[PDB]
Coordinates of N, CA and C in Angstrom, one line a residue:
Chain T
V156 N 12.6 15.9 -19.0 CA 13.8 16.7 -19.2 C 13.5 17.8 -20.1
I157 N 13.1 18.9 -19.5 CA 12.6 20.1 -20.2 C 13.3 21.3 -19.6
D158 N 13.7 22.3 -20.4 CA 14.5 23.4 -19.9 C 14.3 24.7 -20.7
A159 N 14.6 25.8 -20.2 CA 14.4 27.1 -20.8 C 15.6 28.0 -20.7
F160 N 15.9 28.7 -21.7 CA 17.2 29.5 -21.7 C 17.0 30.9 -22.3
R161 N 18.0 31.7 -22.0 CA 18.2 33.0 -22.7 C 19.6 33.3 -22.9
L162 N 19.9 34.2 -23.9 CA 21.3 34.6 -24.3 C 21.8 35.6 -23.3
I163 N 23.2 35.7 -23.3 CA 23.9 36.8 -22.6 C 24.8 37.4 -23.7
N164 N 24.8 38.7 -23.8 CA 25.6 39.4 -24.8 C 27.1 39.3 -24.5
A165 N 27.9 39.4 -25.6 CA 29.3 39.1 -25.4 C 30.0 40.1 -24.7
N166 N 29.9 41.4 -25.0 CA 30.7 42.5 -24.5 C 30.5 42.6 -23.0
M167 N 29.3 42.4 -22.5 CA 29.1 42.6 -21.0 C 30.0 41.7 -20.2
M168 N 30.2 40.5 -20.7 CA 31.0 39.6 -19.9 C 32.5 40.1 -19.7
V169 N 33.0 40.7 -20.8 CA 34.3 41.3 -20.7 C 34.4 42.4 -19.7
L170 N 33.4 43.2 -19.6 CA 33.3 44.2 -18.6 C 32.9 43.5 -17.2
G171 N 33.2 44.2 -16.1 CA 33.1 43.5 -14.8 C 31.7 43.1 -14.5
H172 N 30.7 43.6 -15.2 CA 29.3 43.3 -15.0 C 29.0 41.8 -15.2
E173 N 28.3 41.3 -14.3 CA 27.8 39.9 -14.3 C 26.4 39.8 -14.9
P174 N 25.9 38.6 -15.3 CA 24.6 38.5 -16.0 C 23.4 39.1 -15.2
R175 N 23.3 38.8 -13.9 CA 22.0 39.1 -13.3 C 22.1 39.8 -11.9
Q176 N 21.0 39.6 -11.1 CA 20.8 40.2 -9.8 C 20.4 39.1 -8.9
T177 N 20.6 39.3 -7.6 CA 20.5 38.2 -6.6 C 19.5 38.4 -5.5
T178 N 18.6 37.5 -5.3 CA 17.8 37.3 -4.1 C 17.7 35.8 -3.7
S179 N 17.5 35.4 -2.5 CA 17.8 34.1 -2.0 C 17.0 32.9 -2.6
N180 N 16.0 33.1 -3.5 CA 15.5 31.8 -4.1 C 16.1 31.4 -5.4
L181 N 17.4 31.8 -5.6 CA 18.1 31.4 -6.8 C 18.6 30.0 -6.8
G182 N 19.0 29.5 -5.6 CA 19.9 28.4 -5.5 C 19.3 27.0 -5.3
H183 N 18.0 26.9 -5.1 CA 17.5 25.6 -5.0 C 17.6 24.8 -6.3
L184 N 18.0 23.5 -6.1 CA 17.9 22.5 -7.2 C 18.8 22.9 -8.4
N185 N 18.9 24.2 -8.7 CA 19.4 24.6 -10.0 C 20.9 24.4 -10.2
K186 N 21.3 23.2 -9.7 CA 22.7 22.8 -10.1 C 22.8 22.5 -11.6
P187 N 23.6 23.2 -12.3 CA 23.7 22.9 -13.8 C 24.3 21.5 -14.0
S188 N 23.9 20.9 -15.1 CA 24.5 19.6 -15.5 C 25.9 19.8 -16.1
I189 N 26.8 18.8 -15.9 CA 28.1 18.9 -16.4 C 28.1 18.9 -17.9
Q190 N 27.2 18.1 -18.5 CA 27.0 18.0 -19.9 C 26.7 19.4 -20.5
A191 N 25.7 20.0 -19.9 CA 25.4 21.4 -20.4 C 26.6 22.3 -20.1
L192 N 27.2 22.2 -19.0 CA 28.3 23.0 -18.6 C 29.5 22.9 -19.6
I193 N 29.5 21.9 -20.4 CA 30.6 21.8 -21.4 C 30.4 22.8 -22.5
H194 N 29.2 23.0 -22.9 CA 28.9 24.0 -23.9 C 28.9 25.4 -23.3
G195 N 28.2 26.3 -24.0 CA 28.3 27.7 -23.6 C 27.6 28.2 -22.3
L196 N 27.3 27.3 -21.4 CA 26.6 27.7 -20.2 C 27.3 28.8 -19.5
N197 N 26.5 29.8 -19.1 CA 27.0 31.0 -18.5 C 27.7 31.8 -19.6
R198 N 28.9 31.3 -20.0 CA 29.6 32.0 -21.1 C 28.7 32.5 -22.2
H199 N 27.7 31.8 -22.6 CA 26.8 32.2 -23.7 C 25.4 32.4 -23.3
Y200 N 24.9 31.7 -22.3 CA 23.4 31.8 -22.0 C 23.2 31.3 -20.6
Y201 N 22.0 31.6 -20.0 CA 21.7 31.2 -18.7 C 20.3 30.6 -18.6
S202 N 20.2 29.6 -17.7 CA 18.9 28.9 -17.4 C 18.0 29.7 -16.6
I203 N 16.7 29.4 -16.7 CA 15.6 30.0 -16.0 C 14.7 29.0 -15.3
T204 N 14.3 29.3 -14.1 CA 13.5 28.4 -13.3 C 12.1 28.2 -13.9
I205 N 11.6 27.0 -13.8 CA 10.3 26.6 -14.4 C 9.4 26.0 -13.4
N206 N 8.1 26.3 -13.4 CA 7.2 25.6 -12.6 C 5.8 25.6 -13.2
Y207 N 5.0 24.6 -12.8 CA 3.7 24.2 -13.4 C 2.6 24.7 -12.5
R208 N 2.0 25.8 -12.8 CA 0.9 26.4 -12.0 C -0.4 25.7 -12.5
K209 N -0.7 24.5 -12.0 CA -1.9 23.8 -12.3 C -3.1 24.4 -11.4
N210 N -3.9 25.3 -12.0 CA -4.9 26.0 -11.3 C -6.0 25.0 -11.0
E211 N -7.1 25.4 -10.3 CA -8.2 24.6 -10.0 C -9.0 24.2 -11.2
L212 N -10.0 23.3 -11.0 CA -10.9 22.7 -12.0 C -10.2 21.7 -12.8
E213 N -9.1 22.0 -13.5 CA -8.4 21.0 -14.2 C -7.7 20.0 -13.3
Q214 N -7.6 20.4 -12.0 CA -7.0 19.4 -11.0 C -7.9 18.2 -10.9
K215 N -9.2 18.4 -10.9 CA -10.1 17.3 -10.6 C -10.3 16.4 -11.8
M216 N -10.3 16.9 -13.0 CA -10.4 16.1 -14.2 C -9.2 15.2 -14.5
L217 N -8.4 15.0 -13.4 CA -7.2 14.2 -13.5 C -7.1 13.3 -12.3
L218 N -7.1 13.9 -11.1 CA -7.0 13.2 -9.9 C -8.2 12.2 -9.7
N219 N -9.4 12.7 -9.8 CA -10.6 11.9 -9.5 C -11.1 11.2 -10.7
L220 N -10.2 10.9 -11.7 CA -10.7 10.6 -13.0 C -10.0 9.5 -13.7
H221 N -8.6 9.5 -13.8 CA -7.9 8.6 -14.6 C -8.1 7.2 -14.1
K222 N -8.4 7.0 -12.8 CA -8.7 5.8 -12.2 C -10.0 5.9 -11.4
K223 N -10.9 5.0 -11.6 CA -12.2 5.0 -10.9 C -12.9 3.7 -11.2
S224 N -14.1 3.6 -10.6 CA -15.0 2.4 -10.8 C -16.3 2.7 -10.2
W225 N -17.3 1.8 -10.4 CA -18.5 1.9 -9.5 C -18.9 0.5 -9.0
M226 N -19.5 -0.3 -9.9 CA -20.0 -1.6 -9.4 C -18.8 -2.5 -9.1
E227 N -17.6 -2.2 -9.6 CA -16.4 -3.0 -9.4 C -16.2 -3.1 -7.9
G228 N -16.7 -2.2 -7.1 CA -16.5 -2.3 -5.6 C -17.2 -3.5 -5.0
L229 N -18.0 -4.2 -5.8 CA -18.8 -5.3 -5.2 C -18.7 -6.6 -6.1
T230 N -17.6 -7.2 -6.2 CA -17.4 -8.3 -7.1 C -16.6 -9.4 -6.3
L231 N -16.9 -10.7 -6.6 CA -16.6 -11.7 -5.7 C -15.5 -12.7 -6.2
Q232 N -15.7 -13.2 -7.4 CA -14.7 -14.2 -8.0 C -14.4 -15.4 -7.1
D233 N -15.4 -15.9 -6.4 CA -15.4 -16.9 -5.3 C -15.1 -18.3 -5.8
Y234 N -14.8 -18.6 -7.1 CA -14.5 -20.0 -7.4 C -13.1 -20.4 -7.0
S235 N -12.6 -21.4 -7.7 CA -11.3 -22.0 -7.4 C -10.2 -20.9 -7.4
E236 N -10.4 -19.9 -8.2 CA -9.3 -18.9 -8.3 C -8.9 -18.4 -7.0
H237 N -9.7 -18.5 -5.9 CA -9.3 -18.1 -4.6 C -8.7 -19.2 -3.8
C238 N -9.4 -20.4 -3.7 CA -8.9 -21.5 -3.0 C -7.5 -22.0 -3.4
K239 N -7.3 -21.9 -4.7 CA -6.0 -22.3 -5.3 C -4.9 -21.4 -4.8
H240 N -5.3 -20.1 -4.7 CA -4.3 -19.1 -4.2 C -3.9 -19.4 -2.8
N241 N -4.9 -19.7 -2.0 CA -4.6 -20.0 -0.6 C -3.7 -21.3 -0.5
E242 N -4.1 -22.3 -1.3 CA -3.3 -23.5 -1.2 C -2.0 -23.5 -2.0
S243 N -1.6 -22.3 -2.6 CA -0.3 -22.2 -3.0 C 0.5 -21.5 -1.9
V244 N 0.0 -20.4 -1.3 CA 0.7 -19.6 -0.3 C 1.0 -20.4 0.9
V245 N 0.0 -21.1 1.5 CA 0.3 -21.8 2.7 C 1.3 -22.9 2.5
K246 N 1.2 -23.6 1.3 CA 2.1 -24.7 1.0 C 3.5 -24.2 1.0
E247 N 3.8 -23.1 0.4 CA 5.2 -22.7 0.4 C 5.6 -22.1 1.8
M248 N 4.6 -21.6 2.6 CA 5.0 -21.1 3.9 C 5.4 -22.2 4.8
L249 N 4.9 -23.4 4.5 CA 5.4 -24.6 5.3 C 6.9 -24.7 5.3
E250 N 7.5 -24.6 4.1 CA 8.9 -24.7 4.0 C 9.6 -23.5 4.5
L251 N 9.1 -22.3 4.3 CA 9.6 -21.1 4.9 C 9.8 -21.3 6.4
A252 N 8.7 -21.8 7.1 CA 8.8 -22.1 8.5 C 9.8 -23.1 8.9
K253 N 9.9 -24.2 8.2 CA 10.9 -25.2 8.5 C 12.3 -24.6 8.4
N254 N 12.5 -23.8 7.4 CA 13.8 -23.1 7.2 C 14.1 -22.3 8.5
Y255 N 13.2 -21.5 8.9 CA 13.4 -20.6 10.0 C 13.7 -21.3 11.3
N256 N 13.0 -22.4 11.5 CA 13.3 -23.3 12.7 C 14.7 -23.7 12.7
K257 N 15.2 -24.3 11.5 CA 16.6 -24.7 11.5 C 17.5 -23.6 11.6
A258 N 17.2 -22.4 11.0 CA 18.0 -21.2 11.1 C 18.0 -20.5 12.4
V259 N 17.3 -21.1 13.4 CA 17.4 -20.5 14.8 C 17.9 -21.5 15.8
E260 N 17.9 -22.8 15.5 CA 18.3 -23.8 16.4 C 19.7 -23.7 16.8
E261 N 20.5 -22.9 16.1 CA 22.0 -22.8 16.4 C 22.2 -22.4 17.8
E262 N 21.5 -21.5 18.4 CA 21.6 -21.1 19.8 C 23.0 -21.0 20.4
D263 N 24.0 -20.7 19.5 CA 25.4 -20.7 20.0 C 25.6 -19.5 20.9
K264 N 26.5 -19.7 21.9 CA 26.6 -18.6 22.9 C 27.5 -17.5 22.4
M265 N 27.3 -17.2 21.1 CA 28.1 -16.1 20.5 C 27.3 -14.8 20.7
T266 N 27.7 -13.7 20.0 CA 27.2 -12.4 20.2 C 26.6 -11.9 18.9
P267 N 25.4 -11.2 18.9 CA 24.7 -10.9 17.7 C 25.6 -10.0 16.7
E268 N 26.6 -9.4 17.2 CA 27.6 -8.8 16.3 C 28.2 -9.9 15.4
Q269 N 28.5 -11.1 15.9 CA 28.9 -12.1 15.0 C 27.8 -12.6 14.1
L270 N 26.6 -12.5 14.5 CA 25.5 -12.8 13.6 C 25.4 -11.9 12.4
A271 N 25.5 -10.6 12.7 CA 25.7 -9.6 11.6 C 26.9 -9.9 10.8
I272 N 28.0 -10.3 11.4 CA 29.2 -10.7 10.7 C 28.9 -11.6 9.6
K273 N 28.3 -12.7 9.9 CA 28.0 -13.7 8.8 C 26.7 -13.5 8.1
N274 N 25.9 -12.4 8.5 CA 24.6 -12.2 7.9 C 24.8 -11.7 6.5
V275 N 24.2 -12.4 5.6 CA 24.2 -12.0 4.2 C 22.9 -11.9 3.5
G276 N 22.1 -13.0 3.7 CA 20.8 -13.0 2.9 C 19.8 -14.0 3.5
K277 N 18.6 -13.9 3.0 CA 17.5 -14.8 3.3 C 17.2 -14.8 4.8
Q278 N 17.2 -13.6 5.4 CA 16.8 -13.5 6.8 C 15.4 -13.9 7.0
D279 N 15.1 -15.2 7.2 CA 13.8 -15.7 7.2 C 12.7 -14.8 7.8
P280 N 12.6 -14.6 9.1 CA 11.5 -13.9 9.7 C 11.1 -12.6 8.9
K281 N 12.0 -11.7 8.8 CA 11.7 -10.4 8.1 C 11.7 -10.6 6.6
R282 N 12.6 -11.3 6.0 CA 12.7 -11.3 4.6 C 11.5 -11.9 3.9
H283 N 11.0 -13.0 4.6 CA 9.9 -13.6 3.9 C 8.7 -14.0 4.7
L284 N 8.9 -14.4 6.0 CA 7.8 -14.9 6.8 C 6.7 -14.0 6.9
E285 N 7.0 -12.7 6.9 CA 5.9 -11.7 7.3 C 5.0 -11.3 6.1
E286 N 5.6 -11.1 5.0 CA 4.9 -10.6 3.8 C 3.8 -11.6 3.4
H287 N 4.1 -12.9 3.6 CA 3.1 -13.9 3.3 C 1.9 -13.8 4.2
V288 N 2.2 -13.5 5.5 CA 1.1 -13.3 6.5 C 0.2 -12.1 6.1
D289 N 0.9 -11.0 5.7 CA 0.1 -9.8 5.4 C -0.7 -10.0 4.2
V290 N -0.2 -10.7 3.2 CA -1.0 -11.0 2.0 C -2.2 -11.8 2.3
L291 N -2.0 -12.9 3.0 CA -3.1 -13.8 3.3 C -4.2 -13.2 4.1
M292 N -3.8 -12.4 5.1 CA -4.8 -11.6 5.9 C -5.6 -10.7 5.1
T293 N -4.9 -9.9 4.2 CA -5.6 -8.9 3.4 C -6.7 -9.6 2.6
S294 N -6.2 -10.6 1.8 CA -7.2 -11.2 0.9 C -8.4 -11.8 1.6
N295 N -8.2 -12.6 2.6 CA -9.3 -13.3 3.2 C -10.2 -12.3 3.9
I296 N -9.7 -11.3 4.6 CA -10.6 -10.4 5.3 C -11.5 -9.7 4.3
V297 N -10.9 -9.2 3.2 CA -11.7 -8.4 2.3 C -12.8 -9.3 1.7
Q298 N -12.4 -10.5 1.3 CA -13.4 -11.4 0.7 C -14.6 -11.6 1.6
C299 N -14.3 -12.0 2.9 CA -15.4 -12.3 3.8 C -16.3 -11.1 4.0
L300 N -15.7 -9.9 4.1 CA -16.5 -8.7 4.3 C -17.4 -8.4 3.2
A301 N -16.9 -8.6 1.9 CA -17.8 -8.3 0.8 C -18.9 -9.3 0.7
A302 N -18.7 -10.5 1.0 CA -19.8 -11.5 1.0 C -20.8 -11.1 2.0
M303 N -20.4 -10.6 3.2 CA -21.3 -10.3 4.2 C -22.2 -9.0 3.9
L304 N -21.6 -8.1 3.1 CA -22.4 -7.0 2.7 C -23.5 -7.4 1.7
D305 N -23.0 -8.2 0.6 CA -24.0 -8.5 -0.4 C -25.1 -9.4 0.2
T306 N -24.9 -10.1 1.3 CA -25.9 -10.9 1.8 C -27.0 -10.1 2.4
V307 N -26.9 -8.7 2.6 CA -27.9 -8.0 3.2 C -28.4 -6.9 2.2
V308 N -27.5 -6.4 1.3 CA -28.0 -5.3 0.5 C -29.0 -5.8 -0.6
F309 N -29.0 -7.1 -0.9 CA -29.9 -7.6 -1.9 C -30.8 -8.7 -1.3
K310 N -32.0 -8.3 -1.1 CA -33.0 -9.2 -0.3 C -32.4 -9.6 1.0
Chain Q
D301 N -57.0 -28.6 39.3 CA -56.1 -27.5 39.7 C -55.0 -27.4 38.6
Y302 N -54.4 -28.5 38.3 CA -53.4 -28.5 37.2 C -54.0 -28.1 35.9
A303 N -55.2 -28.5 35.6 CA -55.9 -28.3 34.4 C -56.2 -26.8 34.2
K304 N -56.4 -26.1 35.3 CA -56.7 -24.6 35.1 C -55.6 -23.9 34.5
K305 N -54.3 -24.2 34.9 CA -53.1 -23.5 34.4 C -52.2 -24.4 33.6
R306 N -51.9 -25.6 34.1 CA -51.1 -26.5 33.3 C -51.8 -27.1 32.1
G307 N -51.0 -27.7 31.3 CA -51.6 -28.3 30.0 C -52.1 -29.7 30.3
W308 N -52.5 -30.3 29.2 CA -53.1 -31.7 29.1 C -54.6 -31.6 29.5
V309 N -55.2 -32.7 29.9 CA -56.5 -32.7 30.4 C -56.6 -33.4 31.8
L310 N -57.6 -33.1 32.5 CA -57.7 -33.6 33.9 C -58.3 -35.0 34.0
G311 N -57.4 -36.0 33.9 CA -57.9 -37.4 33.9 C -58.6 -37.9 32.6
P312 N -58.3 -37.2 31.4 CA -59.0 -37.7 30.2 C -58.6 -39.0 29.7
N313 N -57.3 -39.4 29.7 CA -56.7 -40.6 29.1 C -56.5 -40.3 27.6
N314 N -56.7 -39.0 27.2 CA -56.5 -38.5 25.9 C -56.3 -37.0 26.0
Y315 N -55.2 -36.5 26.5 CA -55.0 -35.1 26.9 C -55.0 -34.2 25.7
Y316 N -55.8 -33.1 25.8 CA -55.8 -32.1 24.8 C -55.6 -30.7 25.5
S317 N -54.7 -29.9 24.9 CA -54.3 -28.6 25.4 C -53.1 -28.1 24.7
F318 N -52.5 -27.0 25.2 CA -51.3 -26.4 24.6 C -50.1 -27.4 24.7
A319 N -49.2 -27.3 23.7 CA -48.1 -28.1 23.6 C -46.8 -27.4 24.1
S320 N -45.9 -28.2 24.6 CA -44.6 -27.7 25.1 C -43.5 -28.0 24.1
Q321 N -43.8 -28.3 22.9 CA -42.7 -28.5 21.9 C -42.0 -27.2 21.6
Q322 N -40.6 -27.4 21.4 CA -39.8 -26.2 21.2 C -38.9 -26.5 20.0
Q323 N -38.9 -25.5 19.1 CA -38.1 -25.6 17.9 C -37.1 -24.5 17.8
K324 N -35.8 -24.8 17.4 CA -34.8 -23.8 17.5 C -35.1 -22.6 16.5
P325 N -35.6 -22.8 15.3 CA -35.8 -21.8 14.3 C -34.6 -21.0 14.0
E326 N -33.5 -21.7 13.8 CA -32.2 -21.1 13.5 C -32.0 -21.0 11.9
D327 N -33.1 -21.1 11.2 CA -32.9 -21.0 9.7 C -32.3 -19.8 9.2
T328 N -32.5 -18.6 9.9 CA -32.0 -17.4 9.4 C -30.5 -17.4 9.3
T329 N -30.0 -17.0 8.1 CA -28.6 -17.0 7.8 C -28.0 -15.7 7.9
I330 N -28.6 -14.8 8.6 CA -28.2 -13.4 8.6 C -27.7 -13.0 10.0
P331 N -26.5 -13.3 10.4 CA -26.0 -12.7 11.6 C -25.0 -11.7 11.0
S332 N -25.3 -11.3 9.8 CA -24.4 -10.5 9.0 C -24.1 -9.2 9.7
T333 N -25.0 -8.5 10.3 CA -24.8 -7.2 11.0 C -23.7 -7.3 12.0
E334 N -23.7 -8.4 12.8 CA -22.7 -8.5 13.9 C -21.4 -9.1 13.4
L335 N -21.5 -10.1 12.5 CA -20.3 -10.8 12.0 C -19.5 -9.8 11.2
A336 N -20.1 -8.9 10.5 CA -19.4 -7.8 9.8 C -18.6 -7.0 10.9
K337 N -19.3 -6.7 12.0 CA -18.6 -6.0 13.1 C -17.3 -6.7 13.5
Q338 N -17.4 -8.0 13.7 CA -16.2 -8.7 14.1 C -15.1 -8.6 13.1
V339 N -15.4 -8.7 11.8 CA -14.4 -8.7 10.8 C -13.7 -7.3 10.8
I340 N -14.6 -6.2 10.8 CA -14.0 -4.9 10.8 C -13.1 -4.7 12.0
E341 N -13.5 -5.3 13.2 CA -12.7 -5.2 14.4 C -11.3 -5.8 14.2
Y342 N -11.2 -7.0 13.5 CA -9.9 -7.6 13.2 C -9.1 -6.6 12.4
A343 N -9.7 -6.0 11.4 CA -9.0 -5.0 10.6 C -8.6 -3.8 11.5
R344 N -9.4 -3.5 12.5 CA -9.1 -2.4 13.4 C -7.8 -2.7 14.2
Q345 N -7.6 -4.0 14.6 CA -6.4 -4.3 15.4 C -5.3 -4.8 14.5
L346 N -5.4 -4.8 13.2 CA -4.3 -5.1 12.4 C -3.5 -3.8 12.1
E347 N -4.2 -2.6 12.4 CA -3.6 -1.3 12.1 C -3.6 -0.5 13.4
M348 N -3.6 0.8 13.2 CA -3.6 1.8 14.3 C -2.6 1.5 15.4
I349 N -1.5 0.8 15.1 CA -0.4 0.7 16.0 C 0.8 1.2 15.2
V350 N 1.5 2.2 15.7 CA 2.6 2.8 14.9 C 3.8 3.0 15.7

């Protein structure tokens, strides 16, 4: 929340003259706040557009820098910390699946508009079933690939 | 005739020659180059559908 201002002289407002001049890049975004509009906005001063010209060189000392690594790209943590994670996620997905089965056995000859009618929450398939699959796939694929690389890069 | 090309000895009663024993030699634990291919392929078909 940063802003820049300048004054408008009193007598000019009484005369027909308005504060400035117009070309079409005035009106983007620059909706004044009501809070500011309560005080002397326009009546006493006007806002000026602001922008941050981040030139080259200082760009890279931020983008390619605040986050990075090197050897961290090849770390395994293959003990129980992995197997225990798998045996938590699959365990709870067992109940998610049983829920979805029950939640579809209804098979009533109604119309999906009525389904939306009573639809409120916990839409099993999309709400939960799928994110568990995506997480499990990600973790296991990455782990196996890293092990297969280290098995050849070192002896 | 067999002795000229085939193994063992020609009526020795104690054959001496080359052996036909076969050993798998599957000790190598490195199918890494191809198995890595397979895994990358699974990642390939988890994406690029939009």
